[PDB]
Amino acid sequence: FQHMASWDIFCSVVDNYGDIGVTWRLARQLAAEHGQAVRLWVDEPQAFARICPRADPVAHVQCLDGVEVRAWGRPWAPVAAADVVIEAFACELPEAHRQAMRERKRPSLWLNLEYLSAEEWIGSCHALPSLQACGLSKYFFFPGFREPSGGLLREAGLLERRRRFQASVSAQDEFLASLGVRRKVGERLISLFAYENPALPGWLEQLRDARQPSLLLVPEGRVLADVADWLRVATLAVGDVHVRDALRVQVLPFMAQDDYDRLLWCCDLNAVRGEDSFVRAQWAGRPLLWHIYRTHLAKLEAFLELYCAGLPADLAENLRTFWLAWNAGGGLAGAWEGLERQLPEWRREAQRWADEQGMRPDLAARLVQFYADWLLEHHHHHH
Ligand SMILES: Cc1cn([C@H]2C[C@H](O)[C@@H](COP(=O)(O)OP(=O)(O)O)O2)c(=O)[nH]c1=O
Numbered sequence: 001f002q003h004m005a006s007w008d009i010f011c012s013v014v015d016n017y018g019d020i021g022v023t024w025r026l027a028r029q030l031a032a033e034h035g036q037a038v039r040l041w042v043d044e045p046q047a048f049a050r051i052c053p054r055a056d057p058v059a060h061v062q063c064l065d066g067v068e069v070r071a072w073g074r075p076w077a078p079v080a081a082a083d084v085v086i087e088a089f090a091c092e093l094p095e096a097h098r099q100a101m102r103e104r105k106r107p108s109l110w111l112n113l114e115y116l117s118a119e120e121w122i123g124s125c126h127a128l129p130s131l132q133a134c135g136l137s138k139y140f141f142f143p144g145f146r147e148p149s150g151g152l153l154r155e156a157g158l159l160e161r162r163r164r165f166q167a168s169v170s171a172q173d174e175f176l177a178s179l180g181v182r183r184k185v186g187e188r189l190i191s192l193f194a195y196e197n198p199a200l201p202g203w204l205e206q207l208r209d210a211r212q213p214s215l216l217l218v219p220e221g222r223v224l225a226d227v228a229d230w231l232r233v234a235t236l237a238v239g240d241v242h243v244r245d246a247l248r249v250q251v252l253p254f255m256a257q258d259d260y261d262r263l264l265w266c267c268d269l270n271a272v273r274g275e276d277s278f279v280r281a282q283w284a285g286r287p288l289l290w291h292i293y294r295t296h297l298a299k300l301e302a303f304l305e306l307y308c309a310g311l312p313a314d315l316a317e318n319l320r321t322f323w324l325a326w327n328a329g330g331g332l333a334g335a336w337e338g339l340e341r342q343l344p345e346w347r348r349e350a351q352r353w354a355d356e357q358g359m360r361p362d363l364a365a366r367l368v369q370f371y372a373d374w375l376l377e378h379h380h381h382h383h
Contacts, residue, residue, distance in 0.1 A: 005371060006037040006082035008108075010072070012091035013044035018274035020047045021257065023088045023113075024067075025153050025276065029364040031066035033156050036368070039082060043072040043091075051257050081108045084371050087138070088113045102136055109374050110138040111367070116145075116152070116275050118303040123148045127370070141370070143363055145306055152279055154362035159354060162283060165265050175262045179252055180239055183215060187248070188343075189267045192218045192227075193277055194291040198329040201230045206336050207247040217263065219252045268343065285354035287346045292327055300327060311349050315342045 007030055011023040020042060027040040042048050048069065049057035056062055060071045081100035085108045087093055093101075101108035110132075114122070122142040126149050129137045143150045165171050176183060183189055190207075194200070200223065207214045218227055220238055227249060228236040241250045255263070260277070264270045264284040271289040272281040281288035292300055304323060308316035322335035339346075361369075376383050 002035055004035055004037055005084060007039070008082040008085040008097070009038065009040045009088060010086065010091055010093060011040065011042050011088050012072070013042065013047040016274060017047060017051055018276045019089055020044075021051050021274075021276040022153065023086075024048065024051060025257070026086075026113075026364060026367075027067045027069075028065045029153065029155060030368070033364065034368050037068075037082070038066070039068045039070055041070050041072040043074075045071055050254060053256055084109045084111065086111045086113050086141075086367075089115060098134055098136070102134055106375075106378065107136055109371055110136055111370075112138050112140045114140060114142045116143040116279070117299050118145045118306050119298060120146075120302070126150055139370075139374075141367065145303070145357070147360075151360055151363040151366050152357060153276075153364060154283065154358065158283055159285075159358045162261075162265050162285065165262065166285070172266050175259075176266055179217075179255070179263070181215075181217060181250060181252070184213065184248075187213045187215050188269070190214055190216050191263055191267045191270045191272075192216055192223060193221065193270075193272050194223045195273055195293050196222055196226060197291060197326070199326050199332050200226050202330060202332050203326075203336060204230050204244075204247065206333065208244045210246045210340070213246045213248065215248045215250065217250055217252050217267070219260070219263075220254045224251065268347070282350075282357065283354055285347075285351040287343055287350055289326055290323060294327070296327070300324070307353065310352065312345065314338070315346055315349070318342065319346070 009023050009027050011020055013020050023040060027038045030036040031038045045055070045057040049055045052064060054064055055069065062069050076094035076096055078096040079100070081097055081104060083106070085093065085097070085101055087110070090112060101110060122144050123146070125140055126142040126144065128140045130140065131137045141150045143152060145152070173183075204227070207216065218224055224236050228234070231242050231244070231249065233242065236251055238251050238253045241248060252263070261280055261284070264281055264286070267286060269287040269289065270281040270284060271291065272278050273291040273293070278290050290300070290303070300323065304320050308320060311319065318335055318338040322332060322339050325331035325335055373383060
């Protein structure tokens with residue numbers, strides 16, 4: 001015997017990949033690490049196929065890594081509701097599903113999974129119940145970088161695996177070779193995952209004109225047209241390499257989520273965006289550059305306050321200036337010169353940040369614990 005609860009996770013893909021990226025990561029961890037029964041409902045199967053190449057985008061139901069991945073139909077096909085229903089990022093549940101949740105002898109626990117924020121105020125709202133009209137309550141679940149919050153997604157054993165990988169030159173060289181990448185001695189490795197960014201050509205010129213060489217690895221995506229314009233090339237295809245003095249640019253394929261982790265683990269600096277890659281870059285224990293797509297400023301400044309609190313003043317000031325300019329479309333010159341000379345110290349601090357965050361109970365564990373305490377309380381039992 002083993003305790004098993006069922007989970008419905010609802011995901012509406014509006015733009016980009018992090019909403020399915022985060023809910024898929026969570027779904028897989030609930031199934032694989034906690035032995036839960038998980039249904040992940042996705043309204044756009046093509047997005048899911050991008051982050052999970054094993055998936056069949058035309059199938060209405062399929063089982064991947066123990067998760068039952070199901071197409072969110074229009075119109076909605078009525079099904080029974082799980083023990084827990086997660087409404088990710090306020091995507092709005094099907095009406096018939098709310099009826100099914102309330103008809104159960106034990107009504108479904110209804111959670112709203114929120115976007116991640118370092119803003120202090122989310123602590124006052126984490127786990128807040130909200131009575132709905134139908135008589136069910138939902139609970140807001142706010143991931144966060146400090147307590148109280150719902151924590152951060154982090155797989156069992158992740159940092160131990162990351163440390164072993166980064167300690168093995170051969171493991172890194174083998175992984176990079178599988179992408180067609182061969183680092184040169186003394187060449188700094190930078191990954192670029194961003195939105196369209198008018199600050200990019202100014203940074204590329206600084207990488208081109210530097211004393212030390214850089215290899216810029218660009219998974220296919222938005223920013224590639226911007227890079228192609230800066231390179232003055234009409235086409236940029238997977239596998240293409242272009243050299244501009246101290247800067248080498250190489251186009252990567254858009255790879256599976258786990259392979260993208262390994263890329264982040266190889267690089268000396270990871271430019272990332274959104275929500276999931278933002279956190280994966282932190283688990284990589286390496287310098288990072290975060291692109292939020294434009295009321296984004298509150299989240300950016302709040303994270304900088306927390307992330308910079310442990311850095312030396314000069315590193316903190318250059319990091320903040322660069323990140324703000326990176327998200328404001330220009331003004332990177334003085335920031336990058338000063339920031340580049342501090343990358344070794346920043347790397348040591350990034351490792352410490354990852355280790356400290358790694359001591360906090362991870363988000364999936366907190367979610368499973370939330371259900372356990374809620375269930376016991378629902379039956380007026382001790383804990
Ligand atoms: C660059 C890249 C990202 N990803 C994944 C990482 C993340 O889970 C997802 C991107 O989500 P995220 O980082 O939150 O940003 P956005 O919402 O703007 O897309 O895409 C891959 O699976 N392969 C890749 O090659």
